[PDB]
Amino acid sequence: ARYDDILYFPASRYPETGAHISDAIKAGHSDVCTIERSGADKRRQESLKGIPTKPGFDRDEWPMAMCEEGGKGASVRYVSSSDNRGAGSWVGNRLSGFADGTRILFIVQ
Amino acid sequence: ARYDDILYFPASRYPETGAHISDAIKAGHSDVCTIERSGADKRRQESLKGIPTKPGFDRDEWPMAMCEEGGKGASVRYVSSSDNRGAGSWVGNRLSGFADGTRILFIVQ
């Protein structure tokens, strides 16, 4: 199988983050996050190099920095801070129990 | 004087747009639009770089793209489409008689 677990991303709750994820996946970036937490600080810095903050927004990365698939080449878009914080918590809390190397398919619904 | 004419933005009719304008002005973005229409397409594209479209909402810029003050660094917020369409028409129509270079103070009432 190409994944170990599925997460159904709640676009109804977090529609802007959800739309970025869907957009990024329509564009060929991976729908699977292979959890890798030790190198996430580095990937974020790679994905966001040259992208400044914007007030009212967070810089959303897909694939995420906590995934082997993240870092350079990641799709980066501004998402309204409330939407992206809620998404970040939802995803963080749902992945916290899986070990590094667990392959998580994301389905945006 | 620092302006040539005043517009009293009708927050009762367009409260979401009005709220963004009021917030952005509180944040130090100019309360004066110096009308400049030739460069408006480019300012708009600059203010919205990396901000995706969102269904049911418009990307509202303050300062507006039709102002010298707009473009890079403009405050952007998603505003519901009905409120922002009506606002944009209200402003557009009330400024249509003024030449480029006219300085309009906005007061949100």
Explain this structure.
Two copies of one chain form a homodimer. Chain A is of the alpha+beta class and 109 residues long. Chain A has one domain (1-109). Chain A has helices at 15-26, 40-47, 81-95, and strands at residues 5-9, 32-34, 57-62, 75-80, 103-108. The longest helix of chain A has 15 residues, at 81-95. Chain A starts with a strand and ends with a strand. Chains A and B meet through helix 1 and strand 4 of A and strand 4 of B. Chains A, B: Residues 38-62 are annotated as: Disordered. Chains A, B: Keywords: Signal. Chains A, B: Residues 38-93 form the Deoxyribonuclease NucA/NucB domain. Chains A, B: Residues 38-47 have a biased composition (Basic and acidic residues). Chains A, B: Disulfide bonds join 33-67.
Question: What's the topology here?
Answer:
Two copies of one chain form a homodimer.
Chain A: E1 5-9, H1 15-26, E2 32-34, H2 40-47, E3 57-62, E4 75-80, H3 81-95, E5 103-108
Parallel strand pairs in A: 1-5
Antiparallel strand pairs in A: 2-5, 3-4
Organism (chains A, B): Bacillus licheniformis (strain ATCC 14580 / DSM 13 / JCM 2505 / CCUG 7422 / NBRC 12200 / NCIMB 9375 / NCTC 10341 / NRRL NRS-1264 / Gibson 46)
Biased composition (Basic and acidic residues) (chains A, B): 38-47
Protein name (chains A, B): Nuclease
